[PDB]
Design a protein around this ligand. Structure first.
Ligand SMILES: [O-][O-]
Ligand SMILES: [O-][O-]
Lengths: 243, 244, 243, 244, 243, 244, 244, 244
């Protein structure tokens, strides 16, 4: 039994303490016309969490390019956050450029339903994808033992942004959908007159009045989405621990 | 906001109606010693949902090899479910093998918290990964407008099973983690004594006492997990609409 | 054990989604001066329901002739409603001209008390006859296993309209009542004063001061009603099954 | 602002005072293995109600032919019921053979959701069809100003009894349905396997797997039900008011 | 137990349906400067009730001269009331001139505490005497099996009016009280100074400072009151039955 | 408004203090198979009250002959009750033989609803006729300014016991009813059969099936009742204030 | 607004996670017949908190001799606790030998009222002294900006112990009280007979019947107590930062 | 447990009765720009309490030098307060200069939660340090059997005042800290940028970015603070009881 915010709702208003200072969410990013990915982890100085922060750091530029910032969250204090970041930079050679929220009393975790049955003291690995209007668009709740696949989070925001501007719905596994590949779906008619006209228009390739699509996405947009997936599928040429 | 089940909790007992008959959850699958992925979609005869079922359908064999079952869910009735399936087999050429739950009154939906602000009438694209003990292991909530990445659902299950059998935690992006590649993490010590013991054992490659790992996964484990991502990243050979 | 709206009550104001679009009840029909028959059925792609829709469809011009609209309702989505109508037109050779409300979550079903002990998920075969003032005039509840007799619904709107227009009550089995045939009943006196005055005027055929009647209904109105019943008793010469 | 018992629920157990005496519902009828139709009317000594009582009385044997009893209801006392019955027999020539419940204070009325917005003091023209198990099978609510069509009430209990005994659903306007005439409908498949089996058996005429029917009703069952409708459609040969 | 209005309270304001039409109580009578007696009976077409109605009807002229109206009440409909009045006028030869409230549902009965332990469906034989100010002056509650003595009701009203106009209290059995006969009582002093003054005045015949009286009621008034009682005591010369 | 026990209920069980001693109602009278009239009056040493007590005392023999005990009630103490009783025996020459409840604080008055608007401090002139079973049979509420007619209270008791013994209803103005004189009414049939059986037997005189009566009461019983009415109507030959 | 446990009450029973593992309080110390001092600090890697742990650590053997154990507490996790302790040992050259409760979510902090208006997320510098019976004996609440005087905590436990065994009360500034020196107070008389007895006995030096005392403490006890204070007064000869 | 005021919160506003008159807290001291130490004790004419008052009196000048006032508190009346003071002055020879609040009924006692489990009638030995803004800075709760170390209350106040003036945090045991002696700690950075800016300033002496300090306190400040501790560890030259 847990209470989580919902897709479609504005991200709960709240002032938080990060290792970059105090900021108000989602105001802080909305004001910059930025989307933001809020993600949490159990505790500082933990292995899986470290691999995740490093993964986010390496992909940071990719997020910035999409006008998407990142912000972390754990039940630890800001001193530990900073110490942990120093450890990471010193031993892994990677600098974490984004802020981490320090939520000592679980206030934030509770408002976001990040505390599950696994642990009553530490948050699981949740992910909130909020858009430039401060509206929650997607929620993922990974557990303590499983690290996230950061490239899917990039594919999600990218797909969301494309769907938003092109006024299209996105098929499964896009841009590599088995049925229409990189095609994007035209929102289904909701009335008999609409369906009738959708077919009469014959302006799109259709499988039925309720299944039409086209290919309005830029070739660069597609290639970029494909880049995320190929990076996820590729075994790294050099492993960081080797230094 | 809304209420949802939680990771670590046993799937909420319930009797549900599907196009394959009435079944109790999670007993139906727990009793078979099988994990099950419960996913929902807004409604039958909708585009994104269609592509997602086809995707699950084609990867159905991959879920079987892992001992995992699929079960869908939407507010539509069984008659619509069955007709929609017939439309897909006839027009796309793909037979949907797994059952779909009919939840006309949102009963199940409310229990699993699948009804968000994006519509008080239809469910979002939720995903519940439940292990063979009926325990919720992972939850994903996608919106109406974005289709899911089924191969990632496959990676989640395989990794979770690996972690269970090897007593290891799985690093970000496994089996292609930028730091330790395909290695698996050893649960960190939680006391000073355990911390000292770990270090003085020299039993693992370690970056610090709280970060040790090895590579206990078999080549098969690693390669199958990787195959999932490779497929997701691969540009389709031939599209299914072309001869539909 | 199920609260419902009542005869004499204004129809529960509500905005509903139908396969013809979104409309507000009862306003949509009131602003047109139309009576409307809202009826429900358990689910799309079900036998009995299909026959009832075909039957309503065939009697459509009859309702339209009277100034009465039709509007169905079930828990299925608009997508299923449209596919179901397509199947009907293709296989029965009959097009469904009226809209069908999509009520997943059964919000409308609840307000109208359409969910009974039989099923907790699908509505029974309910019928609400509402007039051009948006007032509920009659309600009928048929079970899943029994298809309605559409011609009786035509008799009802026909009779109620006449009564309102002629300011008369309609006897049982009209227009073939065993006692006064196609006669119509004059509303009974409510005071001794009135009773004496009516029996005094000798203005109507009367059995007692509380039972007077005349025959104000035009020949055409009487015949239209008789036609409804005659159709209900006539065995079809050709079954659509064979089309 | 209204509340009523529901189809599928057992008729609310209650002891009622009628002009034939006090009886226990629905037990009185259930113990005889008889179905019963309970209907109410506004008040005694009112025109429409009189024509209706005469209509039921003239068809009383038809209900007895179906093992169905009748019992009326109004907020009037037993004394009025009896006096009113005296008037009908004396002035119209028909003896009301069934009992009427006297519900002053609207106790029964309220329990059956019979008091509507139209009138706060008098019940509307409600109709409850209850089977030999004491279960409500159908409910109809007619207004003060419109008299019921008794023959349809006959078609209903007749069709319900057949659907029950033959395990079939009754199509619209039966036995004169415009699609399968007097054919009775086979309960539709709820699962895919059932659907496929239903189609391969070829033991029924079908438009689709969810729409199959056959003609199991006897010719007598069919003509009798059609007779009810034929009767409702016939203009009287002799108006009772004449030799009244 | 139950709840009834109280002596001294205003008759509970209400609109009522009678067989003479709708009327508001007590306003309808207050406005005419008339007192009114409201009495109930269990049901129409019942023996005792019928005898009481014939008795009221016989004394109608007596109440009328006193400026008192009559109105009955039962849970039967207005239709039963008219038929019941017709039965009495035809089979007894007496016409009931006053209205009868039709109270199905027992709405009024509850307001006046007329439903007792005897019957939960029918009203007992209650009697409410209301003056011109619309004030309840006396309440009687007779059982089902016991008809009322209408003459005592007239005595009550007569005495009550005299007391009001004469500023006097009425002794027991007036006008035939065993101590002062037809004399009326002077309201007793309530302070020591009054008890003394009343005594030092010698203006009234007194047994004590608190028991003084005189004879202010005219012969006519006294005679009318005795008339009421004489009639109650007299054995009927002819019986309406034999006629 | 106010709460009051009802006709048909058993008199509210209570222990009361009287100027004759403490007693329990209605047990004190029930146990000795006696009926009892409980009447109240505002306060001791008040004129109208004094006249009613004298009136009651004068009729004590008649009430006793019917097996009816009397008992008064006011909010004064037992000390005033006795002084007032002494004043009456001395200045009126009449001795009050029945007990009087002393209800300071109005506890008993509240239970019987004797405190109306007129006075929140003193009780009105209530009357409670209670039978040998402890059941309330009639209730009269007279105001402060109007003394009761004690002879009608006698007629009521008399009519009641008679109705109870002969199993008959008592018409208005009995025993001088205008329609049936000293006749007593036979409880009306409540069912169609009963109604016909009553008519078929023609064993009673009847105006209709619901109005039958006979003359079962003895001459002595009838004459006693008329005696009460004759006294209420007779002008006093000797006024007690003079004989004083 | 805040609620804290109280002197005289038993330390709230609870299971806590420390960097030494899980232990039950106060049972874990009670079962050993030991007294324990629970103290908290805002967060790991903070300056004053570090100077404090180093101070407790230098005095560890002293608490040891008294049969007193130490246990710290902050809202940080065990990983930070262990990392922080390594930092101290590495840079100050001092090893912290006692456990630190890791109270994320502040469950423990809330039951002990350790969260004040200063910070809603971090605890102040509280100290709970609990005896071998598990009863809270003293509570000190220092702020974020003020480090504690650890020697006074030792003076408190020592004083309490002598008080308990010698059945005496401890004067202000003991063992250097301006009035009676190292003397201990004899619990005063609570009754007049006691006061008089106490006085005519003359066994104690008294200023009045309510102020008597003696010198029951041994020189070692007094010496030990004075040692705590001398150290508190003395300025370290060697500052640990010099060779850090 | 129980409820108490919290550090950070403004002292509960109230009007209290002292043996010096009626004053409002904390307004009376705030308005003078003074801090005040509120301490309580169980009852007047009790040994330990007496030693404590004597201790505070002797140090009254030291508190005054710092601009800090003293005010006591107990459930006794003002009369006992004054009689008790007269006793101490004539028998011990020490005048108590500060006021004492008289709280019979324990009103103030509850507001400050000074009633613990041992006694439900007398306050325990509490201490509240309040600054010139009326804010609570520190709270100490000593038991009945243990007298306070007044010199530590002095060290707490002066340190707290230094910290505010110098914008510094005070290390454990200051001015005799084992790590930095009489140096004061600079408030730690709370952001990555502040952290790097501090390390790049070489402005102070640091063990790490979060542990930097300097020695801004004047020698006077340091030695006066050390003097307090030196006095506490010093065996009195002459005991006051010796000439009482
Ligand atoms: O009933 O008209
Ligand atoms: O702790 O500063």
């Amino acid at each position: 039994p847990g209470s989580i915010p919902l897709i479609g709702e504005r991200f709960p208003e709240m002032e938080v303490t990060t290792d970059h200072g105090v900021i108000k969410l989602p105001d802080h990013y909305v004001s910059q016309g930025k989307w933001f990915v809020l993600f949490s982890h159990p505790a500082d100085f933990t292995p899986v969490s470290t691999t995740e922060f490093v993964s986010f750091a390496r992909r940071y530029e990719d997020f910035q390019r999409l006008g998407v910032d990142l912000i972390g969250l754990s039940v630890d204090s800001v001193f530990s956050h900073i110490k942990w970041k120093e450890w990471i930079e010193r031993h892994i050679g990677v600098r974490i450029p984004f802020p981490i929220i320090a939520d000592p009393q679980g206030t934030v975790a509770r408002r976001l339903g990040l505390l599950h049955a696994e642990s009553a003291t530490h948050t699981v690995r949740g992910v909130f994808i909020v858009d430039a209007r401060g509206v929650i668009r997607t929620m993922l709740y990974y557990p303590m033992e499983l690290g996230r696949l950061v490239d899917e989070i990039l594919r999600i925001v990218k797909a969301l942004k494309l769907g938003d501007s092109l006024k299209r719905a996105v098929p499964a596994d896009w841009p590599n959908n088995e049925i229409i590949g990189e095609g994007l779906i035209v929102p289904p008619p909701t009335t008999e007159d609409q369906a009738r006209a959708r077919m009469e228009s014959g302006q799109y390739r259709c499988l039925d009045w309720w299944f039409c699509w086209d290919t309005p996405a830029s070739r660069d947009d597609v290639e970029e989405a494909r880049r995320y997936l190929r990076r996820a599928a590729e075994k790294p040429a050099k492993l960081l621990y080797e230094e």
